[PDB]
Each structure stands twice: as structure tokens, then as C-alpha cells.
Write a protein that binds this ligand. Structure first.
Ligand SMILES: OC[C@H]1O[C@H](O)[C@H](O)[C@@H](O)[C@H]1O
Ligand SMILES: OC[C@H]1O[C@H](O)[C@H](O)[C@@H](O)[C@H]1O
Ligand code: NA
Ligand code: NA
Ligand code: NA
Ligand code: NA
Ligand code: NA
Ligand code: NA
Ligand code: NA
Ligand code: NA
Ligand code: NA
Ligand code: NA
Ligand code: NA
Ligand code: NA
Ligand code: NA
Ligand code: NA
Ligand code: NA
Ligand code: NA
Ligand code: NA
Ligand code: NA
Ligand code: NA
Ligand code: NA
Ligand code: NA
Ligand code: NA
Ligand code: NA
Ligand code: NA
Ligand code: NA
Ligand code: NA
Ligand code: NA
Ligand code: NA
Ligand code: NA
Ligand code: NA
Ligand code: NA
Ligand code: NA
Ligand code: NA
Ligand code: NA
Ligand code: NA
Ligand code: NA
Ligand code: NA
Ligand code: NA
Ligand code: NA
Ligand code: NA
Ligand code: NA
Ligand code: NA
Ligand code: NA
Ligand code: NA
Ligand code: NA
Ligand code: NA
Ligand code: NA
Ligand code: NA
Ligand code: NA
Ligand code: NA
Ligand code: NA
Ligand code: NA
Ligand code: NA
Ligand code: NA
Lengths: 719, 719
């Protein structure tokens, strides 16, 4: 629900269990009053006013020294109001002045959920959602700012976006534009962020917010491996199952900044949106710019509920693929199996092997195009290497279909190698600075996807390939960060180009299962999930490390989105050995699939594949649609444990991987969550029965281990 | 409810929201299965068995090395089973052997709540409570042990006691006897205990339980100022409003020991009961010994709920006084007002002063008897000093009644000074060791209250005094710890003597308001609360320190039990100055009352007394009967804040004392608890209205302070 009280100038947003409230003050500033547990109260009483030294006053406050935007909580604070905190908006006007001082002009409440020009965004119908659009303006900056709030009641989600219009005659530049700001007048908080590196993404870092700013971001042209565009502000003491916590998730696959600051008056400001760095976005007279969306949510009941709200929102209101609600073929991918050393016959052999085991699809990964026999050539030359494939792609696809298997293929359309026909013809299509030799990364360069002619060339090549036969699946990868950034519009316009190509591709090929990739999880974000219902979670396929990566990814993203494959050992990234069974349990917390040559496996491991596939298919709906619960913290605990529970709470699958081993082992219990306390549950394999209450308070004892890194799955059914 | 499953040999105790379960194993040992959230399951599945090095086996386990009482969880573990952990029971038999190895014999389930011979205990009716009595025995020790479990469903309380019988022909000695043991097979915990000193009792200490034991106790002959006989075992992460926590409270005013231990297998054992030190209790053939009671409770919802369960249990099932459910006269006490320097005329002047202000009662404190003109003589000489009083006690009482005032008096019956007629007549009545000069403390000695003839002498003297007139109130004090302990029965038998005298006194004078005292809160325990509905909480009457003492005392004990008086400044214990208003707010979190000479006060402060009394009387029922909530931690926070809420949640009184002051003050909010989220509440003085949800999530901003240590009261009424 969205309500306006014209007398108090208060806007109230209600979801099923939360309330967000704002107010236009007597000077026209849009103040933030409240976000938290549902309330019908007017929360304007929380605002207080004192003469605070060096916190100065709008001219319009006259002699009232107690009124300062350096103290007051705001929906969209800006540089140019006298506020000295981190701010959401900076405009440099047609005369060179960095100032924006925004006052209320108008509003509208609409049924349904706004969409964003050229960008992914949460979607819903007119019954499920309402939109509030508030217009603010600065007559001196000659800017008009449209704040968009989307309210999805059942999901306990509030979205925010911004449109900025130049209302003057001269060009302005947008120098900083956040999507969302939460201003807290009170509270002690921790900041949870998800950091990492290539092949080890999304480690949880949780620290108290001390005085000053905790900040993180990306200027890589991508959402990045290093810091995901996501933040949780947890009240001190909040756990998985209790206490207040607030999320912000950026629906965007490019650059971002997140800032959390505890100020001089013990107030907290949280910002998420575009990066200020390499962002100086020109806006001509009468033109509008759109800031990408942030999804906000609140839980009074701990982190697990917060995550569940995000999982539901992403599956049902971000991902557009039919595969959200359909079985997804179990695939085998050629990359760790063969790298570049394959032929068409190799690929068909992989199909034959995989068909005998119950695998549904073979994905031919990198190495099929140009003269791509290593990673030093041929990006941009999306012509099939028929010498290597021993014939045409059409014929290969048919040979694979004759084995009863679907076919998938890898592409990397944003990129170019110097050693390519495309680069010899069009070296100026690479992103570069004139006269400067560019950074190389994996011995490749980015194509300038801000340019239509560049995108069209590559799009046409990709269409020729995909039109050769029935291709069920595409893995779209992106293997380096952006450098040599030549202008202040490029980071943003590049990503608009990517999304345009991706929308064109999905529209032309609407039955395709698109898996996003960027050296693993380098663009693991809700912007990508709007197009691809799964993303390759990491190039690290070590089961033990995957427990941490998958744990971290689960704070915002649903299991169904996490690409996860059983790979060979010793693992190719870590050198560690794990049992086949543990690799299976871990990879079932995601898309499942295989990425190895099964011909090298023992008969016993081949039979394990058969049984794994039967297990995954049996529990696929539960894993993908069920309510997810983290049952341990793999950074600190003896085990990595998680579970999925059906909507009706009548079925659950519990997964456990042991992380530590010593002699004379203590008994380890796994405590379950999300069950009905008074219901009785049957554990399948053992045939023992337990109450929900028992399973949640005492849990179940794990069988004693006899080897390292053992794993378990337990299935419970309500009697 | 109490259930026995004869086939599984499981006993289940259910309260409204909790379940406690135990089992007799195939060897006859009484194992502890579970205590926590309510469940109908059989929790025997949590038991596990492994061959654990150096954890040995009952002979009766045969060749099964996996069965060890050094590992298994037990209701009442003992020295002599092969268990090497801290234990509950040690018996030294008629041959000198320290061993007890207890096996199940029989049980009974009875309606109602057991009572204890010569001791205070929780009481209830046959509809409110059930009792389980389990009999165990060791044929070699020739001991029979009766475990008593009391179940008070609505209160979520389980009580435990023990009776130990010598079934052999020779004398045995009881060397250790706990009342309660909780064995956890799993969990990470913190231990909360309440430590202090004279004039600064019951500071909260909360630490993680590391490997080894956290222990505390008293061998002072008293429950003590230094460590209260109370413990909370909180699961890691538990707060005031969420998470599992377990309490044990000893209903006993003598010596005790508490031990919490995390063992070699990461299990936790919690024990509470009698101290092993100075305890070697002889039991002749056929005789029975009774261990004092422990009150256990569990909360799944944090520490505040746990405390509320104790408050309810103590007010409605421990305190026997009519004054639990009646107005208690507002008193003025002569001690800080006059110390020993008073006459009968002084006392009447104090009555006249106090009557003009709305005070109901004058208490003549120490100094009225013998030649007690300082604290160096006359304990034991309970004859009225008619020279000092200018006439008889009867006449004084009448003169006070003529001023419209009730009369109270102080006694200290357990004690004797060398300079007394009693000591010159009966020096052997003091506790002492023959041939050894005794410890002196406040220049006095303890009387041997284990001896009937000693108790009878003093009891008769006290009766003569109390029979002189209408005495509405007695303060029974006790001003030193026990030393020179001459035998292993003395600590326990002394306390039996105290309780016998106290029961005799309360039975003879059933309309008396008895306030317990021991240099303040030196015996602030539920054993005393069975007799006295209030106890002088501390000799520290500094308002700021009282915020900490009262906070700590509230973890187990109700506000109504805490003696608290407005005293003069500079404070006599700390030298600190506080405003009269802050002293009033702080002292209203308890019995209220005054302890100063009002003749020295300004007219403005006298008017404050008038208004304070009106305020206290207006809110007396709410403060004494309402649900109590700690709203801050005075060890860490800016404020000491608390509130009381009516049963129907339609009325609340919120109290705040500021603890810290700086310039350019930040706005401090007090967040309320225990209200109905959707109800609308009117704040009285301001006339503003708020939802419960608003008051609990955002709270209310405190008015800015202009002086140090300011205090506030806010009253809320449901509209
Ligand atoms: O070069 C191919 C290789 O590229 C990236 O590393 C991907 O994340 C891998 O899965 C694989 O597709
Ligand atoms: O000597 C009298 C004195 O004794 C103890 O200190 C009490 O706690 C005081 O309140 C007072 O009664
Ligand atoms: Na302000
Ligand atoms: Na300013
Ligand atoms: Na200024
Ligand atoms: Na500030
Ligand atoms: Na603010
Ligand atoms: Na604003
Ligand atoms: Na601002
Ligand atoms: Na910028
Ligand atoms: Na805000
Ligand atoms: Na990776
Ligand atoms: Na990351
Ligand atoms: Na900081
Ligand atoms: Na960066
Ligand atoms: Na980054
Ligand atoms: Na990331
Ligand atoms: Na600061
Ligand atoms: Na804050
Ligand atoms: Na930001
Ligand atoms: Na990158
Ligand atoms: Na963009
Ligand atoms: Na991606
Ligand atoms: Na990615
Ligand atoms: Na990412
Ligand atoms: Na995202
Ligand atoms: Na699994
Ligand atoms: Na995996
Ligand atoms: Na987990
Ligand atoms: Na055991
Ligand atoms: Na043993
Ligand atoms: Na042994
Ligand atoms: Na042990
Ligand atoms: Na145990
Ligand atoms: Na036992
Ligand atoms: Na034992
Ligand atoms: Na002993
Ligand atoms: Na126990
Ligand atoms: Na004291
Ligand atoms: Na204490
Ligand atoms: Na310890
Ligand atoms: Na002691
Ligand atoms: Na002590
Ligand atoms: Na104490
Ligand atoms: Na240990
Ligand atoms: Na434990
Ligand atoms: Na003990
Ligand atoms: Na003592
Ligand atoms: Na006793
Ligand atoms: Na007492
Ligand atoms: Na006491
Ligand atoms: Na005590
Ligand atoms: Na007690
Ligand atoms: Na008060
Ligand atoms: Na007080
Ligand atoms: Na408090």
C-alpha cells in the first residue's frame, strides 16, 4: 500500500510486515522518517532539532539555527545542501558548479511496478505492486529528480530508482548518482559485505560500523568478483534467526559504490548506487538519465528471513526465464574436461558417455571458433572451426542429438584478441585511449559495446552460429575487467550496450537457457539474473571452497541461480582431493551438472553419477523452489550445513559437509530450521520419526566420520 | 504435566512452553535427555555411544566400552560411577569410602507441589502443580536418594530438590550435595553470574564458557553479597529478547556452590546446590537429609522472558506475605537519618515530619536496645533503652500512632557482642572453636543458631519487645559472615535454626511486614523471600550505583522485593550528589521509602516528597505487579532504563536515568518493550499518542538534558 497524508506531507509505504515513511518538510526537503516493523503511526515525532555547531542552515530556515541538512535524515541527500556526510547526488551544472539542492515539486501513486529504460528491474503486476514517483527539483542547477519507489507487499520488498532530467539549456554532468539512501537517527550496526577474488568470491565479512565510513565498490566495468553490489546493515546482535536487519541489492552488472557511515551525532547513513569514479555522465538539455534499481528489504526476525525475501523476489520478480518453473537439463561441460584440447569426435564421445549416465545435455565450452586452440587468439572471430570440429556445427549438433542429448555452447561476445581477423580489420573497435598502449588481461581487450556498429557486427555473427541447429543453452562469458576508460559516459553506456545485446538475444531465442558467466561469478548480480536464470557461481569447483562461496552467495541470491558442477580431483584450482559423494552433495546446492570426462572414472564413480542424477531430479523442485536455510557458518563451524523446505513445510532436504577432523571425535548435531514444531517428520533412509520442535532444538546427531570431508543428505517428510 | 513411558523408561515433564525429559537406561542409570522447547518426541535418540579413551565402563556394561558415565548426560551424577566431571553427590560411607553409584528403584507422580522439611520452597496447589519423586539407591554405600521434581505448568518452572537417606547401620556423611544438574550434550554457552561486595551487590558478569569450569559460591554461612546463588546459562548469541537460556535459582540463604563446565567432548554440565566446603553432614542409620530447592526455568525468547518467569514464580509461589497483593506503607527509616544519635523525641519528630509529607510509617532502626550507642556493644541485649527513648517502647509507639503513623523496628537476633550482658552470662553461645580466639567482624560474633536453647532465649526477648505495642514492620538484619566453624554440620544446621526462628516469628505475628536485611543485600535470596516480601537491596543508596544493583537484582528477583529508599546527598557511601528527582525515580523501582531527616530539606524538596509519594501510590500496583523489562544495560549504555507493563498491556510506566554527559549531545531514544504492536498508547504528560510498534522499534526521544544524571518517567495508557 502507498498512502499520502497531504496535511502532514507524509508518504507511507506498507508491505505485508514492514513500513517505510518519508515527509516533505516546510522548506520542501524530503526527509526520511522510518523503515522497520509495520506501523500506522506518523513517525515524524522521531525528528529532533538542536543548534549543532558547524551544522549550518538553508537560507530559507532564516534565523533558525536548529534546522540543518547536515543533521536531518533524508531520502536522497545531495552535494549542495550544507550536508557534509556522504551524499547520493552530485550534479555539475552548465556553468561548472557542483551543486544540487532538491525541493519537492509533485508526486504520483500508480498501480503496478515501474520499468526502467534500457535496464533490468523488478517487475510485477498492478495487483501485486504499486509505484510512488516523487519529483524534486533545483532551479539553479536546473535539474529535476524523479525518485521511484516500488512496493511489493507480499514480498516485503521496496525498490528504489531515480531519473534525472536536465531542465536547462546547457549540458550538465552527473558526477554521482546513488539509487537508495537509508538514514537512521539511532542504532548500532554491523555491515555485512561479500568480498573475494577470482575463484573465491563472496566471502562474508561482518564488522561493526565504527565512526567513519565502511565503503566498497567496483570500477572494473562489472559488478565484480571483488565486492558484490549488496550490503546488509544488521543491528548489533542480529543473528540468522532474530533481530533487525536491512538489505540493499543493486540490480546492475556494472560499476557501483556502497557507503555506510556512522556520523558525529551517532547517526547512520547507508548508500548504494553507481560509482562516482569514472562517471561524469553528460546530459543535454531536456534529456533524462536513469539510475539502476536497488531492492531494499527489512527483517525483524534475522538474516535468514531477509535472504528468503530476496530469493523470492529474484525468482518471481526478476528472473524472466521459463526455467524458473521448469526442470533444467542436467549438463556436462567440456571446459575442465578438455580445455582447448578437443575435436568434434571428443564432444560426441562426451555426449555418449554422458547419455549412458543419465546426463541430459553437453555444453561445448571455449575453443570451438576461429583458431581458438588456446586463450591467445580469436575472440571476435565467431566462425566455427570446422577443421577442429571435423565438420560443420550443424552436423555436430545432429550427432549429439542422435545420442539423445541436448546441446549448449559458450560465447564471449564483448571481447577481442589482437590476434583475430576482427582486430586486424577494426582495431579501433577495442576500448582504448588514443596514443596509449592498452592494458591486456588474459591477452584480450574489451570491445566498445557502447557503439551500435560494434555490437551489431558481433550480434550478427552469434546469430549465424545459433541458427545452425537446435541449441538449447548458451553460456555467455566475459573474462576481464574494463581499463583504458576514455570518457565519463563509457562505463554506463557500455553496460547499456551489453543489456541491449542480451535483450535482443533473449527475444530472438526465447527458449534458450542462458547461463551468465564472468570468469565464474564476476557478474553475479540481479541485473544479469533478469536475463539468465543461473550464473556460473565460481571457477573454483573445489567442494570445500564451494561451501563458502555458495554460503556467501545465498545471503541475497537463490540456490536456483548458482551454477555448480561436479568436477574431477585432484581439483584443478586447489589441488585438493574430495570424495565423489561430497562433490555431489555440494554441487546439488545449485544447478547441478558435471564438468569432467566420465571415461576416466571408475565404474563405481559412474554409478554414483547415475544415482546423483536420480537424487537431484527427485529433489530438484524442493531445492529450487523451497525455502532456504543456512544451518551453520563454514568460516567458524565444524560443518557446512544447509536445508531446503517446501512451502507447506511438509518436505525438507538437509545437506551437511564436514570441514574439520580430529581423533576421538565429539558428536556433532545439525539443528534444523523452518519446520512446523508440532508436526511429525519421517527421515527417509533411516525410517525414524521426529517432531519439528525436536529437530529444531536438539537437531540430529551426524553419523561418525571415518574419512575427511564427508558429506550427508537427510530427507524429511511430514507424517 | 508429568508422564511415564514404562517401555522406554522415559519421564517427561511438560510446562506450558517447555519440556524436560529423562530416561532410566538398561543398567539403571537416570540419564538426562532434553530440556528446552515443548515436544512430544522421545528424545532418547540424542544419546550417542563411542569407545572414548579413558572414559571407562560400569562393571555391568560387560565388554561394551562405548558405555561410560564419564560421557553420558545424567540427572544426578555422583562420585563413584567412573564419571570424572564435576559431580552432584559425594557420600562417605560407614567404612570411610567416598562412593555413590545410584541406580533406579521406583517413582511416584503426585498432584501438587512437595514441601521441604524445615526449609522454604516453592508452593502451589494440586491443580497448578505436579510432583515426580524418583528413588535411586546404592546398596554398597547404603544410601537411598529421592529426587524431587516440581512442575508448575503456567509458570514454565521446574523445581528440583533431593532427600538422602542412610539405609545402613553405621553413620555416613554427606560430603557434597547439589540440588540440580543440567547436562547438555551440545551447545556453546555463556555463564551469567551476579557478583559484588558489601554496598555494591549483584553486578552482572557474562563470559563465554571456555573449557574447564566457571565456579562461584559462598562459605560465609550466608548466600552472600559476593556471589548470588543464581546462574543463567545462555546459548551464545542470546539477548534480552531472543535465544535460548536456562536459569537455576537456589531457594536458600546459606552456603552454596555453582559449577559450569565445558568438557573434553564439548559437553556442558551445570550444577547448583550446597557448598562442598565446610559440609560433612552426619546422617545416622535411617535418617534423611534434605537438600534445599533449585528453581529451573527455560526461555526460547531471551533473558527478559526468563526473568519474568522467575518474577511470577517468586511473587505467586514463594512469597507468602499478604503484602504481595496489598499496598505497602511508605516508610521513613532512621538509620541514615540519625545513625545511633537519636532519642524518643527524635523519633517522634521524624514521625511528625514524615506525616506532613504523606509518609505512612517510621522505622526505628539500630540503636534502641541495651546501651547501643554505637556498633560495639549490646547485640543479644534486646531490652529497650528507656533512658535513650525517654520512656517505654509502648509509650513511643503510641506517640508515633498519635501522629497518624505506623511503627517499625530493627532487630539482629543472630548476633552477639562481647560487650553485652548476654555474652557475660553465656560466652559459649557464640560460634567459636574451643581454645581459639575468634574472628570478629563489626566487632561482633555469631550466636550458635544451631542450638535451640540459644534461639529460644533470643526469641523470647524479641517477643517481649514486639508485644509492647502495634508494630507494623520488622527489619531483620544480620551484619557479618560466619567464621570459626567448629563442625561439618554447623553451616547447614545454623540455617535450619534461622528458618525455624523466622517461621515461628511469622506465625506468631502474621500481620507483620518483615523486611530481610544483611548489611543490605547479603542474603538477597528466594529462601528469605519465602518469609519477607522485601529485602533491603543494598546499603548503597546512591541513585547511580543503585541503577546497576537494581538491574542485576532484576535478572531473578521481582521489583517488589527490592528495598529502595530516597536518601540524602552528598551520598553517605560514595560522596556523589544527585538530584532529588533522580533519587525518587530510582527508588520507585522497588519498595520506595525515605531514609533521611526531612527537617534538613528545602521546602521545594519537601514538596517533591509529597509529589513522589502521590506518584508511587498511583503506580504502585503497576510497578509491583506489572511485567518488568530492562530497556538498557547500565554497564555499557548512555542510560539506565526500565519499564513495567500491566498484564493486559494497557498501561506502562517507563523510567530512565541518564548516566553519561557530553556537550552538543546526541539525541538518545528509549525503545520500549512488551506492548501490543497495533494498540495506540497515550503518553500522559505530553498528551501525544503512538502505536506499540512505533514505541518498540523507534522508541521515544528523551528531552535534552541540562544537568548531570537527569531522570524521567513516562506513563502510557492504551486508547
Ligand atoms: O575460457 C573458458 C573459461 O572461461 C572462464 O574462466 C569461465 O568461467 C570458465 O567456466 C570457462 O568457460
Ligand atoms: O546497624 C544498622 C545498619 O545495619 C546494616 O548496615 C543495614 O543494612 C542498615 O540498613 C542498617 O540497618
Ligand atoms: Na536535526
Ligand atoms: Na551546513
Ligand atoms: Na555550512
Ligand atoms: Na552529521
Ligand atoms: Na540523519
Ligand atoms: Na532527500
Ligand atoms: Na543533503
Ligand atoms: Na564522478
Ligand atoms: Na533515507
Ligand atoms: Na571464479
Ligand atoms: Na565478492
Ligand atoms: Na567506519
Ligand atoms: Na574496482
Ligand atoms: Na570490486
Ligand atoms: Na561478487
Ligand atoms: Na563520526
Ligand atoms: Na545510528
Ligand atoms: Na554509494
Ligand atoms: Na571484472
Ligand atoms: Na548502464
Ligand atoms: Na554473469
Ligand atoms: Na558472473
Ligand atoms: Na558480481
Ligand atoms: Na545484484
Ligand atoms: Na545437497
Ligand atoms: Na559446487
Ligand atoms: Na550454511
Ligand atoms: Na556417550
Ligand atoms: Na571411567
Ligand atoms: Na575409569
Ligand atoms: Na567428560
Ligand atoms: Na553429558
Ligand atoms: Na543421574
Ligand atoms: Na556420574
Ligand atoms: Na564436604
Ligand atoms: Na541433567
Ligand atoms: Na550493601
Ligand atoms: Na552479588
Ligand atoms: Na571455564
Ligand atoms: Na565464600
Ligand atoms: Na560468596
Ligand atoms: Na548477592
Ligand atoms: Na574441556
Ligand atoms: Na555443550
Ligand atoms: Na554445585
Ligand atoms: Na555474609
Ligand atoms: Na540449612
Ligand atoms: Na535478607
Ligand atoms: Na539481604
Ligand atoms: Na545474597
Ligand atoms: Na535465591
Ligand atoms: Na521509577
Ligand atoms: Na534506590
Ligand atoms: Na535496565
Amino acid at each position: 500500500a502507498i498512502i499520502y497524508n497531504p496535511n502532514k506531507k507524509i508518504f507511507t509505504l506498507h508491505t505485508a510486515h514492514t513500513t517505510y515513511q518519508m515527509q516533505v518538510d516546510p522548506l520542501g526537503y524530503l526527509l526520511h522518517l522510518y523503515y522497520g516493523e509495520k506501523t500506522n503511526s506518523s513517525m515524524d515525532y522521531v525528528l529532533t532539532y538542536a543548534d549543532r555547531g558547524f551544522s549550518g542552515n538553508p537560507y530559507a530556515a532564516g534565523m533558525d539555527r536548529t534546522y540543518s541538512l547536515d543533521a536531518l535524515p533524508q531520502e536522497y541527500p545531495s552535494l549542495g545542501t550544507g550536508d557534509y556526510r556522504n551524499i547520493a547526488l552530485n550534479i555539475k551544472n552548465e556553468k561548472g558548479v557542483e551543486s544540487a539542492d532538491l525541493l519537492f515539486k509533485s508526486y504520483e501513486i500508480r498501480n503496478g511496478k515501474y520499468r526502467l529504460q534500457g535496464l533490468p528491474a523488478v517487475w510485477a503486476d498492478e495487483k501485486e505492486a504499486q509505484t510512488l514517483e516523487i519529483v524534486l527539483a533545483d532551479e539553479n542547477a536546473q535539474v529535476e529528480v524523479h525518485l521511484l519507489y516500488g512496493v511489493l507487499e507480499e514480498n516485503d520488498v521496496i525498490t528504489r530508482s531515480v531519473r534525472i532530467k536536465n531542465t536547462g539549456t546547457g549540458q550538465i554532468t552527473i558526477e554521482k548518482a546513488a539509487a537508495a539512501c537509508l538514514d537512521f537517527v539511532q542504532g548500532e550496526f554491523d555491515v555485512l559485505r561479500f568480498y573475494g577474488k577470482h575463484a573465491m568470491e563472496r566471502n562474508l565479512e561482518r564488522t561493526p560500523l565504527g565512526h567513519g565510513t565502511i565503503a566498497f565498490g567496483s570500477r572494473r566495468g562489472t559488478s565484480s568478483h571483488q565486492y558484490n553490489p549488496a550490503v546488509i546493515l544488521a543491528e548489533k546482535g542480529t543473528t540468522e534467526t532474530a533481530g533487525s536487519c536491512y538489505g540493499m541489492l543493486f540490480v546492475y552488472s556494472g560499476n557501483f559504490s556502497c557507503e555506510a557511515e556512522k556520523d558525529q551525532f551517532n547517526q547512520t547513513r547507508l548508500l548504494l548506487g553507481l560509482n562516482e569514479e569514472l562517471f561524469s555522465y553528460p546530459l543535454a538539455s531536456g534529456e533524462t538519465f536513469t539510475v539502476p534499481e536497488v531492492i531494499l528489504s527489512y527483517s525483524a526476525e534475522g538474516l535468514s528471513a531477509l535472504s528468503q525475501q530476496y530469493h523470492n523476489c529474484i525468482r518471481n520478480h526478476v528472473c524472466r526465464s521459463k526455467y524458473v518453473h521448469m526442470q533444467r537439463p542436467v549438463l556436462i561441460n567440456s571446459w575442465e574436461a578438455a580445455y582447448f584440447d578437443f575435436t568434434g569426435d571428443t564432444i560426441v564421445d562426451l555426449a555418449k558417455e554422458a547419455a549412458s549416465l543419465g546426463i541430459d545435455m553437453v555444453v561445448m565450452d571455449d575453443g570451438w571458433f576461429g583458431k581458438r586452440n588456446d586463450d591467445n587468439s580469436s575472440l571476435g572471430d565467431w566462425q566455427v572451426n570446422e577443421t577442429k570440429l571435423g565438420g560443420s556445427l550443424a552436423e555436430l549438433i545432429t550427432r549429439v542429438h542422435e545420442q539423445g542429448m541436448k546441446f549448449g555452447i559458450w560465447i564471449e561476445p564483448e571481447m577481442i584478441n589482437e590476434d583475430s581477423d576482427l582486430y586486424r580489420a577494426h582495431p579501433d573497435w577495442a576500448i582504448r585511449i588514443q596514443g596509449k598502449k592498452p592494458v591486456r588481461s588474459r591477452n584480450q581487450l574489451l570491445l566498445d559495446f557502447s557503439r551500435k556498429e560494434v555490437r551489431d557486427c558481433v550480434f550478427d555473427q552469434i546469430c549465424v552460429v545459433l541458427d545452425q541447429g537446435k541449441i538449447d543453452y548458451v553460456k555467455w562469458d566475459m573474462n576481464r575487467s574494463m581499463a583504458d576508460v576514455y570518457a565519463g559516459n563509457l562505463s554506463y553506456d557500455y553496460v547499456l550496450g551489453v543489456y541491449d545485446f542480451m535483450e535482443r538475444l533473449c527475444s530472438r531465442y526465447p527458449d534458450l537457457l542462458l547461463e551468465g558467466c564472468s570468469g565464474g561469478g564476476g557478474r553475479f548480480d540481479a541485473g544479469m539474473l533478469y536475463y539468465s536464470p543461473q550464473i556460473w557461481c565460481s571457477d573454483n569447483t573445489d567442494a570445500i571452497n564451494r561451501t563458502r562461496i555458495q554460503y556467501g552467495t545465498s545471503f541475497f541470491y537463490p540456490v536456483s541461480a548458482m551454477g555448480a558442477h561436479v568436477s574431477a580431483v585432484p581439483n584443478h584450482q586447489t589441488g585438493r582431493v574430495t570424495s565423489f559423494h561430497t562433490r555431489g552433495v555440494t554441487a546439488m546446492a545449485g544447478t547441478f551438472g558435471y564438468e569432467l570426462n566420465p571415461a576416466l572414472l571408475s565404474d563405481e564413480e559412474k554409478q554414483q553419477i547415475r544415482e546423483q542424477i536420480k537424487t537431484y531430479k527427485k529433489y530438484e523442485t524442493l531445492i529450487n523452489e523451497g525455502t532456504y536455510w543456512r544451518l551453520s557458518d563454514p568460516f567458524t563451524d565444524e560443518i557446512a550445513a544447509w536445508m531446503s523446505v517446501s512451502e507447506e513445510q511438509d518436505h525438507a532436504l538437509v545437506s551437511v559437509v564436514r570441514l574439520m577432523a580430529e581423533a576421538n571425535q565429539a558428536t556433532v548435531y545439525v539443528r534444523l530450521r523452518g519446520l512446523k514444531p508440532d508436526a511429525v517428520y519421517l527421515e527417509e533412509q533411516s525410517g525414524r520419526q521426529y517432531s519439528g520442535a525436536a529437530l529444531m532444538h536438539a537437531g540430529i546427531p551426524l553419523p561418525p566420520f571415518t574419512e575427511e570431508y564427508e558429506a550427508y543428505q537427510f530427507a524429511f517428510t511430514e507424517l
